[PDB]
Design a protein that fits this description.
Number of helices of chain C: 2
Distance between the termini of chain C: 50 Å
Entry title: Crystal Structure of HIV-1 ConC_Base0 Prefusion Env Trimer in Complex with Human Antibody Fragment 3H109L and 35O22 variants at 3.5 Angstrom
Keywords: HIV-1 envelope fusion glycoprotein, viral protein
Structural class of chain C: mainly beta
Number of strands of chain D: 10
Largest sheet of chain D: 6 strands, antiparallel
Largest interface: A-E, 58 and 72 residues
CATH topology of chain D: Immunoglobulin-like
Chain A: gp120 of Envelope glycoprotein gp160
Strand order of the largest sheet of chain C: 1-8-7-3-4
Number of helices of chain D: 0
Chains: A mainly beta (430), B mainly beta (219), C mainly beta (211), D mainly beta (100), E mainly alpha (129), F mainly beta (128)
CATH topology of the largest domain in chain C: Immunoglobulin-like
Shape of chain D: globular
Distance between the termini of chain D: 21 Å
Strand content of chain D: 35-45%
Assembly: hexameric
Order of helices and strands of chain D: EEEEEEEEEE
Helix content of chain D: under 10%
Bound molecules: a molecule of 10 linked components (NAG-NAG-BMA-MAN-MAN-MAN-MAN-MAN-...), a molecule of 6 linked components (NAG-NAG-BMA-MAN-MAN-MAN), a molecule of 5 linked components (NAG-NAG-BMA-MAN-MAN), a molecule of 4 linked components (NAG-NAG-BMA-MAN), a molecule of 2 linked components (NAG-NAG), 2-acetamido-2-deoxy-beta-D-glucopyranose
Number of strands of chain C: 17
Number of domains of chain C: 2
CATH superfamily of chain D: Immunoglobulins
PDB class: viral protein
Oligomer: heterohexamer
């Protein structure tokens, strides 16, 4: 005969959905990493031998929590900064003089308030063509008939830094270490950790930057791959560099909408008039895109696949809409999707609406000219269209949650069920 | 290698067409750019225009409404025309060989360059005067010497307009020739001199009036 | 008439600046315009010189945007004394159709020269045309600052004098002429005529008499 | 060299016994005994392992006994039966043939 | 020997290494606004929340302060008729948790009902002289 | 608790060799060993050898430690407790008395003293 016996602390876990917190390394920043608890010095990797666990990168909640964290992280940091609402005055934009007639920036003058309803000033600025819309000459900001506009503080740095995502006690996160895991399904060589690795929040389009590289062979991940309306994330087994620059020596005017509200506009270009651009190695891209074409052919009955630019997306979808050392770039990617280097024509906009929100309008202060960013293409973001006997893959974006799924694909949260009940021949007393 | 020669009238009444030709020798006209420049008394240099090897012109914005530059590819001759002339257009007109210059500061794909033009081979330039006054041949008189060394001269009295090419013994006598600058008398004419410190012959070529006259000097 | 002067000592090194400062990456041309002569192209590309122009002339290369175009002239001779224009071709100004402001370079510290005066009586055929003109030729003097004074016998004239202005020769010296119109009756009655030229604080007199 | 009980006859509902003994090298005190229901040509089935430990899905109709010199298998309430002797690291030392 | 290392091991092997999971159970596997301060505060409250309710069941049962703990409830064959070595030497704890998942809540009630009677019995036995 | 399937009649002649396939289903392949048992008519049932798909450990019979070798393919998992594996078997020095049905057996337990014991068998594969 047998009797029930209580075992406390048995390796049993349930599902997910808890409250994850932040973690940062040794150290001002934007992502509130000062309030992030210090990341433990050495991590705690330990393999769960004989354990096969079912993952689901597209139904993960760490992404939905991070995507909500990043959105909430921006609004909390935008409150005390200067709002450019009084900057919606009539802009008497003209033009910036060049030497070559074969624009991108305009010279706009306007009135603003100085000391409240008293004397005003007639000051000028240099706004990009994308930041301005004519009302026909006459001009105004692109987002004033939409909703409120506000400027981010220059005292903050929106550059991506490692953000370790931890689970509290009584919970854990599982880590799939199989090199060829296609994002969903079972996985072996599973390990357990308390915090994720150094995940940098990179917001880009069509190209994944500074992400974790794939190992062994190239990896592809999607949902219903037969469904063309579902987005496709591509991993990179060999990285492709990309150096993007803005070769203009901008100036930073400090005009005052007193009291305290000081708006920093673009002063005057000192030097030559050049255009922003992204340098990618054509010999590296033509071979790397050829190896993605190989893995693409494996997921289809030997169907030759074509690449083409975007369809009808906005400026943030049809172009590699990423961010460098301050300014926001929009590189026309019709060249890569059709032995030396390739160069893209990148535009710059200052008043953007990130995450495609209603009510949001940020202003990126001008950087003091000659900005250079060294990046690393570690992924892609493709879509498909329709349903003849060839396949066309176009770059897409839209939802920024896919950016966080590309790094949180191998993580799922699990709680702990320490209670263990099992029978063994063991009794007690009266 | 390349030689130039500005063959012009020398004096044209106001409100007329100004003909002027510049002949080349060792250089072809369908290969390089050619620019005309004028320099006014009391003013600076006025770049007028230029023509390309493709025979296309571009004029200075101040006088774009007048200047017309042509090309005669039969010979090496190139000409210009300037209508509605006034007393302010009288100056020295130069002929120069212009070279194209591409200054690239960025990448050629996004443009980021500009074309600058420089002239390295110039001409002597011809004199042009604008006045309703007529032309007059000069009066040549011989300045006789008198008794270390000595010197004799050749007076040129009352002509219009500038200039007058002066020679001695028809280019033979070279050293010692000292042709002085003329003077604008109150009557409105110029009068220069020439002195040289076997007989001597004074050579006065007055092309604006075509009057060539030769005279000798002997006490 | 907008010309800006500049005085540089003999033997020293000149530093001719350029007006209308560069707006971006620029390619300048330096022209040496001698007064009433043909301009000579010294510099066509900031630092490049055609064959025949010595090393003494040089500009400033537009390497890093910040410098300014200057034409340095080392070992200044008396022949380098002329006008200097600065053609400005940059990346922010369009077709620069006009040359720069003329820099009137003047070389200081040159050896002075005493003039060589020559007085000519009226020509033989001139009196046959009932017109007489006294010609006083002054050459090889520096600086160009001579005042001519005509004297009939002992009394001055200055009645009908038509004097030129000092023009520079090919010898780096100046030369001027002085004319005086006479009637064959006026020149014949006076005992003698004189052409007094007062250069610096000295005066030289040349005399002619009807014989 | 592992001897069994030759051939055993049975009725309906009674209990028969099958033996499984041998030398001191493969039997019996220091070994584990297992039995199998094996029709020659079909896939066999495990009946009892580790002396008298029953196999999953086996009725209490079966049981096992193990002395210091032999091990026994008894049915209660067809085809052939075999026995094996084994430790924890080696293999199976099969017996002979015994039909019931 | 680490956290959850024997998750795929047999229950007999995992029963020997159950102190590691109970050790690092309140501490991890080793005053600002609501951005991170309030989110991590409510996060660590869930840590002790998931901990006390498991320590609560050990309290009402006769297991308060024990890792292994025997009782007096007989094992019902309706829960599982599996061999004693097919459980401890052939089955993992999560694979075993699924078979009883239907009958998990019944044993919990039966564990505390049996122990309360054990209490009232020891109370009656200590009332003597 | 699963299902093991082998290959069909693969009859050659003496001196040759052959490989019998054996695929698994319904259970974790690396959790239990794979045994091999033949039954020649002249002899009796004779156990051959077992191998662990988890550590690659081998244990053969002394009579078959010369002409017998067996391999195991790694796991192709499906769920947390089920997977698909494979384990074949080759023998050399074949004769006319190595003829009989060959079985692919699954291990009994995962721990204890009776873990490698043949529990789940297959449909049987004849040989010459
Ligand atoms: C991403 O990818 C992007 C695209 O791939 C990439 O963009 C690149 O950006 C860089 C910016 O740094 C660009 O670099 C510039 O290039 C300009 C062009 O240079 C090329 O051409 C010249 C000249 O060639 C003509 O002239 C010579 C005579 O000198 C002839 O012999 C030639 O045949 C030719 O002339 C014929 O051909 C023309 C058409 O081609 C015809 O139109 C013409 O009529 C004739 O028929 C070469 O000399 C250049 O370099 C060569 O030599 C070097 C070794 O010295 C080699 O390394 C090289 O490979 C070549 O072999 C090159 O081929 C440059 O003019 C420019 O540099 C000037 O400008 C900058 C900014 O304005 C200045 O700061 C700099 O100092 C330079 O100024 C000098 O030159 C000007 C004009 O001559 C002078 O006015 C000035 O005073 C100064 O003079 C000094 O020059 C020398 C010392 O430096 C020396 O002579 C003296 O000492 C003097 O003082 C600049 O380098 C590059 O072009 C872009 N790429 C492309 C494809 O366009 C980007 O970088 C990538 N990365 C990122 C992060 O984005
Ligand atoms: C993950 O999952 C795998 C597979 O399910 C687990 O591996 C199994 O582990 C159990 C126990 O740990 C094993 O049972 C034992 O089997 C040995 C037999 O091996 C001995 O004999 C071999 C033949 O001569 C010899 O090659 C062996 O040498 C090595 O063997 C293994 C390599 O796998 C290694 O671990 C050894 O240390 C040797 O280096 C070895 O000599 C048997 O001896 C054992 O019996 C003893 O222990 C039991 C208690 O377990 C006791 O009751 C006995 O009386 C005796 O004292 C025991 O039966 C099993 O064979 C493994 N393989 C399977 C099941 O396929 C692994 O443990 C899991 N790990 C985790 C972390 O979950
Ligand atoms: C994807 O790719 C990379 C990821 O690394 C990013 O590109 C890098 O971005 C960082 C952050 O902007 C750059 O780092 C910067 O370097 C500048 C140069 O530093 C030199 O000079 C200082 C002067 O003292 C030396 O001390 C130093 O050792 C170097 O020699 C610094 O001036 C910058 O410092 C400023 O910011 C930091 C952090 O906010 C402050 O602490 C400083 O006080 C100062 O304000 C800065 O450190 C780096 O140069 C970039 N390139 C490379 C190759 O790393 C991309 O941005 C990233 N994301 C994309 C593309 O979206
Ligand atoms: C965008 O537009 C604004 C105005 O709408 C413009 O600001 C103007 O900039 C110019 C410089 O380019 C300023 O003009 C200068 O003012 C100073 C003040 O004294 C003068 O000294 C300057 O004169 C010098 O330069 C002249 C150049 O030809 C010479 O001719 C002269 O002799 C002097 O050397 C010069 O006139 C002007 O005052 C401002 N105006 C305002 C209202 O700010 C700005 O430059 C434009 N930006 C771009 C990139 O085009
Ligand atoms: C786990 O990692 C192993 C590494 O050997 C890898 O083989 C598994 O993927 C399987 O590889 C097989 C090749 O031996 C292949 O035939 C099989 O289709 C493939 N299965 C899957 C699901 O990719 C890796 N498994 C997983 C689930 O990532
Ligand atoms: C805000 O104003 C913009 C002006 O650009 C509106 O957008 C344009 O609307 C007109 C008229 O409907 C269209 O013809 C253009 O194609 C639109 N262009 C763009 C870029 O949107 C916009 O609809 C206005 N929004 C609100 C809320 O008033
Ligand atoms: C870009 O423009 C700035 C001016 O806005 C330049 O900064 C100047 O640098 C020089 C030398 O380093 C200093 O003497 C000046 O005082 C600086 N100006 C100011 C306003 O600080 C800078 O050099 C320019 N850079 C390039 C590459 O053109
Ligand atoms: C982007 O910039 C990086 C560095 O800024 C370049 O990396 C170079 O890689 C080559 C490898 O063949 C090295 O030999 C060089 O030394 C690296 N550069 C430096 C500065 O160390 C990379 O090639 C650039 N890519 C493009 C497309 O421009
Ligand atoms: C990026 O640049 C390419 C050309 O370099 C653009 O492609 C052209 O698009 C127009 C339609 O707007 C077509 O009529 C042309 O035929 C295209 N050219 C080529 C070569 O395909 C493209 O539109 C640009 N991207 C964006 C977003 O404007
Ligand atoms: C972009 O990718 C390259 C290649 O992976 C990185 O280059 C490595 O940089 C690290 C330092 O961060 C060095 O220790 C390695 O030796 C470099 N390897 C190679 C092959 O160059 C580069 O650092 C990445 N860019 C950034 C900004 O980190
Ligand atoms: C804009 O400015 C220009 C001169 O800078 C002026 O002539 C024009 O009238 C202005 N336009 C308006 C609408 O004020
Ligand atoms: C406001 O703008 C108008 C025309 O745009 C101008 O006349 C007026 O001076 C400006 N206000 C001030 C305070 O300068
Ligand atoms: C499992 O992951 C660990 C991570 O360090 C690695 O060392 C090990 O080789 C991996 N095992 C397999 C079978 O891939
Ligand atoms: C990923 O692999 C699993 C293997 O079980 C398969 O079921 C699933 O359909 C795959 N998904 C994609 C997007 O390839
Ligand atoms: C994928 O899309 C197809 C439509 O072609 C649909 O029939 C199928 O059910 C979808 N798969 C899933 C898992 O929803
Ligand atoms: C990346 O994938 C290709 C296959 O297209 C392979 O040949 C290459 O070796 C992989 N990269 C590395 C570093 O192994
Ligand atoms: C400007 O950027 C270029 C491109 O990297 C670099 O070579 C140069 O040194 C930079 N100059 C300054 C002053 O930062
Ligand atoms: C076992 O559980 C059943 C519930 O189906 C119940 O009827 C029976 O009385 C229980 N027996 C014991 C001994 O607990
Ligand atoms: C639990 O009970 C439900 C309902 O009777 C049944 O469908 C399910 O299979 C049972 N699960 C187990 C593991 O006994």
């Amino acid at each position: 005969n047998l009797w029930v016996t209580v075992y406390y602390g048995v390796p049993v876990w349930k599902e997910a959905k808890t409250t994850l917190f932040c973690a940062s390394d040794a150290k001002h920043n934007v992502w509130a990493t000062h309030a992030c608890v210090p990341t433990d010095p050495n991590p705690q990797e330990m393999v769960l031998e004989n354990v096969t666990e079912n993952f689901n990168m597209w139904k993960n909640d760490m992404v939905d929590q991070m995507h909500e964290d990043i959105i909430s992280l921006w609004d909390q940091s935008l409150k005390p900064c200067v709002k450019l609402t009084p900057l919606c005055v009539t802009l008497n934009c003209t033009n910036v003089n060049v030497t070559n007639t074969n624009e991108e920036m305009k010279n706009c003058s306007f009135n603003t308030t100085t000391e409240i309803r008293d004397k005003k000033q007639k000051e000028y600025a240099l706004f990009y063509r994308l930041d301005i819309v004519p009302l026909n000459s006459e001009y105004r900001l692109i987002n004033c008939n939409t909703s409120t506009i506000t400027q981010i503080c220059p005292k903050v740095s929106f550059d991506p830094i490692p953000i370790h995502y931890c689970a509290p006690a009584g919970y854990a996160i599982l880590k799939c270490n199989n090199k060829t895991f296609n994002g969903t399904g079972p996985c072996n060589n599973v390990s357990t950790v308390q915090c994720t690795h150094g995940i940098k929040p990179v917001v880009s389009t069509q190209l994944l930057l500074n992400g974790s590289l794939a190992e062994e062979e190239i990896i592809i991940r999607s949902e219903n791959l037969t469904d063309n309306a579902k987005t496709i994330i591509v991993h990179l087994n060999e990285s492709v560099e990309i150096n993007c620059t803005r070769p203009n020596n901008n100036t930073r005017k400090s005009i005052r909408i007193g009291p305290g509200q000081t708006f920093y506009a673009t002063g005057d270009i000192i030097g030559d008039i050049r255009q922003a651009h992204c340098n990618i190695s054509e010999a590296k891209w033509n071979k790397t895109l050829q190896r993605v074409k190989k893995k693409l052919k494996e997921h289809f009955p030997n169907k030759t696949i074509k690449f083409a630019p975007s369809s009808g997306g906005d400026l943030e979808i049809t172009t590699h809409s990423f961010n460098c050392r301050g300014e926001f770039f929009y590189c026309n990617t019709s060249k890569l999707f059709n032995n030396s280097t390739i160069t893209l024509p990148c535009r710059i906009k200052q008043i953007i609406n990130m995450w495609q929100e209603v009510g949001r309008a940020m202003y990126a202060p001008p950087i003091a000219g000659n900005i250079t960013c060294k990046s690393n293409i570690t992924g892609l973001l493709l879509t498909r269209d329709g349903g003849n006997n060839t396949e066309t893959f176009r770059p897409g974006g839209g939802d920024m949650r896919d950016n966080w799924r590309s790094e949180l694909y191998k993580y799922k949260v699990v709680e702990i069920k320490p209670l263990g009940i099992a029978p063994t021949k063991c009794k007690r007393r009266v | 290698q390349v030689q130039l020669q500005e063959s012009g009238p020398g004096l044209v009444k106001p409100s007329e067409t100004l003909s002027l030709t510049c002949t080349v020798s060792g250089g072809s006209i369908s290969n390089y750019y050619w620019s005309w420049i004028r320099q006014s008394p009391g003013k600076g240099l006025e770049w007028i225009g230029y023509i390309s090897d493709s025979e296309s012109t571009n004029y200075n914005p101040s006088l774009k409404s007048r200047v017309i530059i042509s090309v005669d590819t039969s010979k090496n001759q190139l000409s210009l025309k300037l209508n509605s002339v006034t007393a302010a257009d009288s100056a020295i007109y130069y002929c120069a060989r212009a070279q194209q210059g591409k200054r690239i500061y960025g990448m050629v794909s996004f443009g980021e360059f500009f074309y600058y033009y420089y002239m390295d081979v110039w001409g002597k330039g011809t004199t042009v005067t604008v006045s309703s006054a007529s032309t007059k041949g000069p009066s040549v008189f011989p300045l006789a010497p008198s008794s270390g060394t000595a010197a004799l001269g050749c007076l040129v009295k009352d002509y219009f307009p500038e200039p007058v090419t002066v020679s001695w013994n028809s280019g033979a006598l070279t050293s010692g020739v000292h042709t002085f600058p003329a003077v604008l008398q109150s009557s409105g004419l110029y009068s220069l001199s020439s002195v040289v410190t076997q007989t001597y012959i004074c050579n006065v070529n007055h092309k604006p009036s075509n009057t060539k006259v030769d005279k000798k000097v002997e006490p | 008439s907008y010309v800006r002067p500049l005085s540089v000592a003999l033997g020293e090194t000149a530093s001719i600046s350029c007006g209308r400062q560069a707006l971006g990456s620029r390619a300048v041309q330096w022209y040496q315009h001698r007064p009433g002569q043909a301009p000579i192209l010294l510099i066509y590309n900031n630092q490049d010189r055609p064959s025949g122009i010595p090393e003494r002339f040089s500009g400033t290369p537009d390497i890093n945007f910040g410098t300014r175009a200057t034409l340095t002239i080392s070992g200044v001779e008396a022949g380098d004394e002329a006008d200097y224009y600065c053609h400005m071709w940059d990346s922010r100004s369009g077709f620069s159709w006009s040359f720069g402001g003329a820099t009137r370079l003047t070389v200081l510290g040159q050896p002075k020269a005493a003039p060589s005066v020559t007085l000519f009586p009226p020509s033989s055929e001139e009196l046959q045309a009932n017109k007489a003109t006294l010609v006083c030729l002054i050459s090889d003097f520096y600086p160009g600052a001579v005042t001519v004074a005509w004297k009939a016998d002992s009394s001055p004239v200055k009645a009908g004098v038509e004097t030129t202005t000092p023009s520079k020769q090919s010898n780096n010296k100046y030369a001027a002429s002085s004319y005086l119109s006479l009637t064959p009756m006026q020149w014949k009655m006076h005992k003698s005529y004189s052409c007094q030229v007062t250069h610096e604080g000295s005066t030289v007199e040349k005399t002619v008499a009807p014989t | 060299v592992l001897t069994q009980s030759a051939s055993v006859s049975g009725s309906l509902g009674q209990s028969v016994t099958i033996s499984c003994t041998g030398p001191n090298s493969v039997c019996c005190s220091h070994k584990s005994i297992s039995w199998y229901q094996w029709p020659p040509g079909r896939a066999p089935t495990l009946i009892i392992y580790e002396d008298n430990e029953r196999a999953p899905g086996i009725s209490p109709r079966f049981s096992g006994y193990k002395s210091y010199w032999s091990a026994y298998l008894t049915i209660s309430d067809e085809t052939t039966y075999y026995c094996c002797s084994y430790t924890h690291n080696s293999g199976c030392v099969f017996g002979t043939g015994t039909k019931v | 020997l680490g956290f959850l290392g024997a998750a795929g091991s047999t229950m007999g092997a995992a029963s020997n290494t159950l102190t590691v999971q109970a050790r690092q159970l309140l501490s991890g596997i080793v005053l600002q606004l609501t951005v991170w301060g309030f989110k991590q505060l409510q996060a660590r409250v869930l840590a002790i929340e998931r901990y006390l309710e498991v320590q609560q069941l050990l309290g009402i049962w006769g297991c308060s302060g024990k890792l292994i703990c025997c009782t007096a409830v007989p094992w019902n064959s309706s829960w599982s008729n599996k061999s004693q070595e097919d459980i401890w030497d052939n089955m993992t704890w999560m694979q075993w948790d699924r078979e009883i998942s239907n009958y998990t809540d019944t044993i919990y009630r039966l564990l505390e009902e049996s122990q309360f009677q054990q209490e009232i019995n020891e109370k009656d036995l200590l009332a003597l002289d | 608790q699963g299902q093991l399937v082998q290959s069909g009649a693969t009859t050659t002649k003496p001196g040759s060799s052959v490989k019998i396939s054996c695929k698994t289903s319904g259970y974790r392949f690396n959790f239990y060993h794979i045994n091999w048992i033949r039954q020649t008519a002249g002899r009796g049932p004779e156990w051959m050898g077992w191998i662990s798909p988890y550590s690659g450990d081998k244990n053969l019979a002394p009579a078959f430690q010369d002409r017998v070798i067996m391999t195991t393919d790694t796991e192709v998992p499906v769920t947390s407790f089920t997977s698909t594996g494979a384990a074949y078997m080759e023998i050399r020095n074949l004769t006319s008395d190595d003829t009989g049905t060959y079985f692919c057996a699954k291990g009994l337990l995962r721990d204890g003293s009776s873990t490698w014991l043949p529990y789940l068998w297959g449909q049987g594969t004849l040989l010459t």
